[PDB]
Paper text:
Various microbial metabolisms use H+/Na+-translocating ferredoxin:NAD+ reductase (Rnf) either to exergonically oxidize reduced ferredoxin by NAD+ for generating a transmembrane electrochemical potential or reversely to exploit the latter for producing reduced ferredoxin. Electron acceptors are either H+ (E°′ = ‒414 mV)4,5 or NAD+ (E°′ = ‒320 mV). On this basis, we postulated an electron transfer route between ferredoxin and NAD via eight [4Fe-4S] clusters, one Fe ion and four flavins crossing the cell membrane twice related to the pathway of NADH:ubiquinone reductase. Architecturally, Rnf shows the highest relationship to the electrogenic NADH: ubiquinone reductase complex (Nqr).
For cryo-EM structural analysis, we elaborated a quick four-step purification protocol for the Rnf complex from [name] and integrated the homogeneous and active enzyme into a nanodisc. The overall resolution was determined to 4.27 Å. The Rnf or RnfABCDEG structure consists of membrane-spanning RnfADE (blue A, pink D, sky blue E), extracellular [name] (brown G), and cytoplasmic [name] (green B) and [name] (orange C). The five reliably identified [4Fe-4S] clusters are semi-circularly arranged with distances between 9.0 and 10.5 Å to their corresponding neighbors. The small FdI domain is highly mobile and the density is too noisy for reliable model building and for detecting an iron-sulfur cluster. Most interestingly, [name] is rotated ca. 35° relative to NqrC27, which changes the position of FMN relative to RnfAE and [name] as well as their redox cofactors. In the structurally characterized resting state, the channel is blocked by two hydrophobic layers. In contrast to the wide vestibule with FMN as part of the side wall in Nqr, the equivalent extracellular half-channel in Rnf is occluded by loop 175–187 protruding in a hairpin-shaped fashion from the solvent-exposed outer wall to the isoalloxazine of the central FMNRnfD.
Author numbering:
A (entry chain D): 7 to 310
B (entry chain C): 1 to 435
C (entry chain E): 2 to 195
D (entry chain G): 2 to 188
E (entry chain B): 1 to 30, 95 to 266
F (entry chain A): 1 to 191
């Protein structure tokens, strides 16, 4: 009555010790993002997470399975769709966006890690395309307000007087709940690199190529100011570096990281949109099997 | 010296501190021996022997009916109770000879006590008489291994000294207790081959072992130190050749195509035992280990003792283990039962505790990318293990999954605890079936 | 009198969109209000009966190298007869405009049909399954277009049914969002029939 | 399987030719209904925008020279009631081709947008009656776009979230107003 | 009338000339009674000890390549892991209680289910020949003793007792040749273990 | 209207399958493997393009003395029928089975819904020649690009057991392509 198989150890860390380390790793970025926004922004993040998690729980009872809720996939997706919203929306619009984030993009395509794209970007693209006027608000200090990415083209608001570059790190800049606190998001990526959750080969190449496009473009009081602006600090760290979307190969990663700034910065500058860290990762995530096929590691004994 | 390594790998936990600094006590046998003819790779020898004969140490038990088989020898003097068939832990019904110990320890005399005069063809023959297996890993007879067909000229002989595996101290002792003898045999292994210079390849983690060795290598030319970095799987034959002489092994190949022939140190000490001390394989070191055992131990077993009595000699189970292990923790097969006879291909025994041995029913693969990072061969396993389940064999062959060494490293890092290797093993058997 | 089953064979099994997946190209382009598609399916129905009645009188005299060029020309003549009806008799001036009217000569269904069936089917044996096929066509629209319209504006047949603020969803009516409704709805057609 | 090109070519030419003849006969018969129905749809949109005029005649001597491509004069018998002005200001995503009705009394009676490339479902469209109906009875003076509450006499409420579109439409009408004062008041 | 001629002559400047390029270039370059699968294993949980708890794939084809040759004490029964339900899309086969069982009236005879099993427990049989053997054993029966209570013990009375002799003792197993059999059916009481099973449609 | 404005205009921001739904009927068909699926678009870089030259000959002066556009719907499409039975002869010239692996769509290459829709599109703006030809090569590269991208998704979807029973094969492909349209929706301000 003795258990048997062929390797006998398989010990390092469970996917709960991956995910849960990410759910603890963004906590200084969220606690730094929340106290300007008060309780007002807390309702969208708790109700979007709990709606996302119980929406996966309805699909475990469809075709039968053991519940993966305890692997903590379902919490990370919820905690990232809530980062994309400005705080003044009614809650049901995110709750239907979390139901799209699970039930279509993840559970129709398979289980955890089989989907070809990030759900939070797909639910966000569905959200911003369906009710943009609900998404227009930039609630901080009461009034609707300008954000730096619109004024940097100069094409839009008459009212512009840009915040000083130190003020963005504190989080005083308006816009969405996570992305403004770029220094504590650096504190969370500095924690995540210490656990060897993720290689440098995506964030370093992606931040480097949008810095080259913003430097030859010339657009800012400094070229450096664009890198902390917007969601791009989330998109080099939490978004594109997601296991399931990301390519497996060591060279496949850096082609995906160089080519993400080929498409993001063009929507930032030549494009009419305020930002490109979203609609850019969905195209480069759809490119991945054509990357992963032709880019393979060299075999240890190739002929010739 | 500087610590060379191959490009990719893991750092499995180092369990050796329980066992590393203890004497090799002899185990005198108590219960009856059984000898299974099947222990060498390839087809078993039929025994010559039949029931009720007197038998002795160093008798051949059975002529090797094929090009790749090697002579058996009894561990002990005794009598033939029965040419009984018996299970191995694989569950093949191997032929075997029961030998009750008489307790008397008769041995046939044989001595030589020089190598230097001898013709090299007399060495390959006396090594076919000795019947010696290559001791670690997969278990070739060494007499085919010393004889390439001529066109693949040697450049060198590294030993494969690097005992990468957790909890396996069995080679570290042979280095402390008898370093001349292993360099003596090396000088021998080098008499059969000139042009090829010799190298030791010990890991840095036994720094005390090479620092004992370092005085012995000063007075002679072709042997020299090559310390290596601690990384599983250094003991695989295809990676150590890239590590030292820096040719890459050809795919599908043999070590003679790389011009060098790895050996275990245990084989070295036993080739020295055959050409000089005149005796074959009565014995090998087990390393029994694990916290469920009442003490860590390092027995010299007499071949063909039942494993149950051997672990009871080691102190027995503080609690019942959930996974007794032939061989090392990774590569080795697990026991069907404790009852099985010990065999020359055993190099150690483990008795894992609940604190490790509990795994989980697996989650779906997350596409983490760690398994491509940790394969030494830069094979891309998740497509291969996914290819056996649909049996889409052209994807197995374009990915070159016939190549893989079954190191077990690709299962070891997975957060999902997908266990890939059994799908790799079923696909490697199906490619032998239909190609 | 086999018309009753030949129709249920054309709509349960030969149906253009839920099964056969020819002819999606109007079926997603026209859906943005359901009337426009009910007129797209009715105009598709009268051209679908009218192709097979003319082509099966023509059927015997075609060499096998040119099985398609006569068929695309007679559908071009039939297509023009209706587009000239569209400019004159009954424009209604929404189905005249937001339909992509020329696209019925290059509808994927009818030429993917006439080679498959009306060539080897009888001239009479063509009027019944063409009427049924066209009927399935509107049906394979109207169940979809009521769903895409009701989750859009909420104005089924153009008419309000809810407070305008609760239903400002529109992405369905947009171009990505109709495909998701087909991937819900045809999966609902298969799961009952599984 | 005889496939000679002479037999094929004569049968081919025949079938294509009979289809072309029949289409030509249909073409000669259909011209008059198309002309009345086209005239009726232009006149119907025109009567809805400028209800005091019954008859409309294009001022064919004046080719537009700025963003205006043509003008239609509105009469009720001999009296001039106004003009319909086609304009295409640059919006955020492209030109907004629209007709603007202007009375001889100097009020904008309304607008109708014809092109569908302006703001593809983003915000609320300018074609919505809640926005487009606000231009009725405004003075023919420069209208201004506001952030906030409407005053009436000179303010146009921007579509929420689509302030760029409202600025573009209001710019196009104001340029049409400027065209009215320089080319249209008194002929 | 004068404008009617223009569509047909203007069509004729593309008119013949595409069929001038076409076929001038196209001429340049133009049985028995049906078989039915049957399991030859009876090992419901209680009737055979498994020697060991099994970490693994939960597919039967994977379980061959582990020490101990899969979970059963018998080397030759099915494991019950159910990899053969994946290949029979017709779904005659239901696993229950750790064994496969074909449903007797759905199976096509399509025969891929034999090749997928490492243990080769399936044998195609004629549907008519209702007496059928039900183990795969290749062993002395004292090793069956501690293992499978249902098993054939190579006990060998059955070759003495069949008049038609549709039986032969190949490789320590019964091996019926079904066409010789008359289905006389005395053999079902002859086995103490009931390793034979008549399908009993009477 | 300039050539770099035009060639992006079918490649990305207003791709024929990903917003307009021109071309959707083949797009569920030979997506099955990328090594076959690129050759349907390599067939499309001729058909779409030589018909754009031949429809310009109708728009040059063969229509012009009639001074009526109405005949064109019965016209250049017969020339599109001429170009496709020419290319079944050269698919068989060395390597037939290249596009024969799903050859039920081989006829629909006469009658792809996109292939008229560059041309009626070309004939509903009265473009000067070379802008129409770079519009043809950009619609063919965008059709080839979306078909190869769905081919890289459906190689993965055929080797994934976890999808719900009813959904297997085709309906999940409608879930992708519209999600693939969700990817292209953010290009709208670039052109
Ligand atoms: C993954 C792998 C790891 C191995 N590790 C060792 C080892 O740590 N020690 C060892 O003596 N042999 C090891 N071997 C066995 C060798 O392949 C080869 O058999 C050995 O280097 C020489 O011993 P031999 O005389 O049996 O050939 C390993 C083999 C493989 C495939
Ligand atoms: C650091 C980290 C970040 C992740 N971020 C996301 C994410 O933003 N969205 C997501 O869907 N999955 C994310 N995942 C993986 C997630 O559990 C699941 O694989 C998704 O369904 C992606 O396919 C992340 C995983 C890790 C380790
Ligand atoms: S076992 Fe095979 S897949 Fe795993 S690391 Fe070794 S070679 Fe790579
Ligand atoms: S098997 Fe494990 S290591 Fe390999 S890709 Fe899947 S999750 Fe990552
Ligand atoms: S004896 Fe019969 S039931 Fe038991 S394992 Fe073997 S075949 Fe299966
Ligand atoms: S084929 Fe044989 S071993 Fe495989 S699952 Fe079916 S009965 Fe079990
Ligand atoms: S695979 Fe064929 S023979 Fe075997 S059970 Fe299924 S249908 Fe019957
Ligand atoms: S009689 Fe019964 S036990 Fe004896 S061999 Fe025949 S079937 Fe097996
Ligand atoms: S059924 Fe009757 S005839 Fe057939 S084998 Fe058994 S005993 Fe013999
Ligand atoms: Fe189509």
């Amino acid at each position: 009555y003795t258990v048997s198989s062929s390797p006998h150890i398989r010990a390092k860390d469970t996917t709960q010790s991956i995910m849960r380390d990410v759910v603890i790793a963004l906590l200084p970025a969220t606690i730094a993002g929340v106290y300007f926004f008060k309780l007002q922004g807390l309702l969208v993040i708790l109700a979007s997470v709990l709606s996302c998690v119980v929406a996966e729980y309805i699909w475990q009872k469809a075709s039968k399975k053991k519940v993966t809720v305890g692997d903590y996939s379902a919490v990370v997706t919820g905690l990232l769709l809530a980062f994309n919203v400005p705080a003044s929306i009614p809650l049901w619009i995110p709750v239907v966006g979390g139901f799209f984030a699970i039930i279509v993009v993840k559970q129709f395509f398979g289980g955890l890690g089989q989907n070809i794209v990030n759900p939070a970007l797909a639910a966000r693209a569905f959200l911003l395309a369906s009710w943009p006027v609900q998404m227009t608000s930039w609630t901080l200090d009461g009034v609707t307000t300008a954000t730096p990415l619109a004024i940097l083209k100069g094409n839009e608001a008459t009212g512009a007087a840009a915040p000083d570059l130190m003020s963005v790190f504190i989080g005083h800049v308006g816009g969405c709940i996570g992305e403004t606190s770029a220094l504590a998001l650096l504190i969370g990526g500095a924690y995540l690199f210490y656990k060897h959750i993720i290689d440098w080969r995506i964030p370093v190449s992606f931040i480097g190529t949008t810095f080259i496009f913003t430097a030859i473009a010339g657009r800012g009081s400094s070229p450096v100011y664009e890198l902390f602006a917007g969601g791009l600090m989330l998109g080099a760290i939490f978004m594109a570096t997601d296991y399931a979307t990301s390519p497996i190969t060591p060279l496949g990663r850096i082609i995906f990281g160089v080519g993400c700034g080929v498409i993001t910065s063009l929507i930032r500058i030549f494009g009419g949109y305020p930002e490109g860290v979203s609609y850019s990762i969905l195209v480069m995530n759809l490119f991945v099997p054509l990357i992963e096929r032709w880019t393979a590691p060299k075999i240890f004994g190739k002929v010739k | 010296m500087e610590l060379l390594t191959f490009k990719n790998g893991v750092h499995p936990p180092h369990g050796k501190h329980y066992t590393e600094n203890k004497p090799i006590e002899e185990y005198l046998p108590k219960g009856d021996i059984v000898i299974p003819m099947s222990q060498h790779i390839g087809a078993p020898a039929e025994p010559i022997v039949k029931k009720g004969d007197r038998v002795l140490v160093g008798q051949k038990i059975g002529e090797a009916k094929g090009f790749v088989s090697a002579n058996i020898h009894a561990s002990v003097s005794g009598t033939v109770k029965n040419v009984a068939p018996v299970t191995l832990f694989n569950g093949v019904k191997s032929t075997a000879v029961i030998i009750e110990n008489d307790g008397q320890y008769e041995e046939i005399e044989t001595e030589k006590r020089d190598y230097t005069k001898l013709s090299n063809e007399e060495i390959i023959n006396i090594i076919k008489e000795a019947g010696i297996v290559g001791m670690g890993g997969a278990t070739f007879p060494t007499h085919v291994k010393l004889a390439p067909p001529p066109d693949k000229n040697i450049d060198s002989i590294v030993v494969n000294a690097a005992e990468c595996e957790p909890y396996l101290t069995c080679d570290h002792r042979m280095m402390l207790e008898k370093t001349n003898e292993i360099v003596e045999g090396l000088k021998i292994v080098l008499k059969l081959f000139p042009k090829a210079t010799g190298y030791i390849g010990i890991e840095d983690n036994k720094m005390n072992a090479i620092k004992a060795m370092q005085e012995a290598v000063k007075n002679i030319a072709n042997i020299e130190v090559k310390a290596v970095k601690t990384k599983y799987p250094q003991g695989a034959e295809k990676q150590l050749i890239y590590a030292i002489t820096k040719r890459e092994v050809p795919s599908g190949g043999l070590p003679a195509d790389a011009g060098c022939i790895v050996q275990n140190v245990d084989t070295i000490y036993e080739i020295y035992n055959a050409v000089v001390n005149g005796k074959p394989l009565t014995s090998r070191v087990v390393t029994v280990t694990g916290d469920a055992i009442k003490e860590p131990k390092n027995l010299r077993f007499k071949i063909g003792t039942s494993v149950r009595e051997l672990v009871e000699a080691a102190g027995g189970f503080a609690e019942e283990p959930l996974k007794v292990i032939s061989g090392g923790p990774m590569m080795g097969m697990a026991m069907y039962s404790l009852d099985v006879p010990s065999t020359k291909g055993t190099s150690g025994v483990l008795c894992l505790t609940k604190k490790v041995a509990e795994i989980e029913e697996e989650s779906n693969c997350i596409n983490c990318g760690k398994c491509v990072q940790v394969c030494p061969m830069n094979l891309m396993p998740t497509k291969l293990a996914t290819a056996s389940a649909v049996s889409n064999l052209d994807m197995f062959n374009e990915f070159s999954g016939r190549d893989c060494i079954e190191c077990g490293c690709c299962s070891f890092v997975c957060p999902a605890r997908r266990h890939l290797l059994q799908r790799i093993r079923s696909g490697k058997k199906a490619v032998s079936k239909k190609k | 009198g086999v018309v009753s089953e030949r129709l249920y064979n054309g709509i349960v099994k030969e149906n253009a969109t839920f099964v056969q997946v020819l002819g999606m190209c109007p079926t997603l382009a026209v859906t943005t209000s359901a009337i426009n598609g009910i007129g797209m399916g009715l105009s598709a129905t009268v051209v679908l009966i009218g192709s097979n009645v003319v082509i099966s009188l023509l059927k015997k005299v075609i060499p096998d190298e040119i099985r398609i060029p006569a068929y695309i020309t007679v559908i071009a003549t039939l297509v023009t007869v209706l587009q000239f009806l569209l400019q004159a008799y009954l424009p209604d001036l929404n189905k005249s405009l937001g339909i992509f009217i020329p696209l019925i000569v290059v509808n994927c269904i009818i030429l993917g049909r006439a080679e498959a069936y009306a060539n080897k089917n009888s001239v009479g044996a063509s009027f019944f399954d063409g009427l049924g096929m066209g009927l399935g066509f509107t049906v394979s629209l109207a169940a979809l277009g009521i769903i895409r319209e009701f989750l859009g504006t909420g104005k089924v047949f153009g008419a309000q049914i809810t407070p305008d603020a609760f239903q400002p969803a529109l992405i369905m009516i947009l171009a990505p969002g109709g495909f998701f409704t087909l991937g819900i709805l045809m999966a609902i057609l298969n799961q009952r029939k599984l | 399987k005889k496939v000679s090109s002479f037999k094929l070519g004569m049968v081919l030419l025949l079938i294509a030719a009979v289809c072309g003849l029949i289409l030509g006969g249909v073409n000669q018969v259909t011209a008059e209904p198309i002309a009345i129905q086209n005239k009726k749809t232009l006149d119907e949109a025109n009567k809805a925008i400028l209800p005091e005029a019954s008859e409309f005649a294009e001022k064919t001597d004046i080719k537009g020279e700025g963003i205006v491509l043509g003008v239609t004069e509105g009469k009720s018998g001999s009296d001039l009631k106004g003009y319909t002005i086609k304009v295409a200001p640059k919006g955020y995503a492209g030109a907004i081709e629209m007709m603007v009705g202007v009375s001889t009394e100097g009020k904008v009676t309304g607008i109708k947008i014809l092109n569908h490339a302006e703001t593809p479902g983003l915000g609320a469209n300018a074609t919505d009656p809640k926005f487009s109906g606000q231009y009725a009875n405004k003075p023919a003076k420069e209208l201004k776009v506001v952030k906030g509450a409407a005053s009436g006499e000179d303010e146009i409420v921007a579509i929420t979230g689509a302030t760029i579109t409202s600025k573009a439409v209001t710019l196009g009408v104001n340029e049409a107003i400027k065209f009215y004062d320089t080319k249209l008041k008194g002929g | 009338m004068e404008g009617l001629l223009f569509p047909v002559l203007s069509l004729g400047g593309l008119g013949v000339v595409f069929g001038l390029l076409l076929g001038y270039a196209s001429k340049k370059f133009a049985s028995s009674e049906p078989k039915k699968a049957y399991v030859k294993c009876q090992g419901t949980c209680d009737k055979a000890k498994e020697k060991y708890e099994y970490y693994g794939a939960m597919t039967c084809v994977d379980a061959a390549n582990i020490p101990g040759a899969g979970s059963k004490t018998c080397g030759f029964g099915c494991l019950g892991l159910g990899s053969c339900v994946q290949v029979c899309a017709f779904d005659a086969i239901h696993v229950e209680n750790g064994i496969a069982v074909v449903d007797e009236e759905a199976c096509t005879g399509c025969g891929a289910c034999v090749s997928i099993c490492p243990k080769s427990v399936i044998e195609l049989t004629p549907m008519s020949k209702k007496v059928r053997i039900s183990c795969n054993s290749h062993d002395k029966g004292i090793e069956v003793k501690n293992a499978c209570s249902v098993g054939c013990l190579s006990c060998g009375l059955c070759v003495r007792n069949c008049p038609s002799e549709a039986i032969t003792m190949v490789n320590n197993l019964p091996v019926i040749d079904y066409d010789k059999c008359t289905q006389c059916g005395v053999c079902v009481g002859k086995c103490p273990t009931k390793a034979i099973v008549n399908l009993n449609t009477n | 209207m300039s050539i770099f404005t035009i060639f992006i205009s079918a490649l990305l921001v207003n791709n024929f399958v990903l917003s307009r739904f021109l071309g959707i009927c083949p797009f569920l068909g030979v997506s099955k493997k990328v090594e076959t699926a690129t050759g349907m678009g390599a067939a499309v870089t001729f058909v779409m393009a030589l018909a754009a030259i031949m429809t310009f000959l109708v728009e040059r002066f063969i229509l012009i003395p009639l001074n009526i556009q109405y005949l064109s719907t019965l016209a250049f499409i017969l020339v599109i029928a001429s170009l496709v039975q020419f290319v079944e002869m050269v698919i068989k010239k060395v390597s037939p089975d290249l596009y024969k692996a799903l050859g039920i769509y081989l006829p629909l290459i006469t009658t792809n819904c996109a292939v008229l829709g560059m041309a009626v599109i070309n004939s509903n703006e009265k473009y000067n020649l070379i802008q129409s030809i770079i519009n043809s090569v950009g619609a063919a590269l965008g059709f080839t690009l979306a078909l190869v991208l769905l081919a890289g998704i459906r190689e993965k979807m055929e080797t994934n057991e976890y999808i719900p029973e009813a959904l297997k094969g085709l309906p999940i492909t409608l879930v992708t392509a519209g999600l693939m349209a969700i990817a292209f929706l953010g290009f709208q301000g670039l052109i």
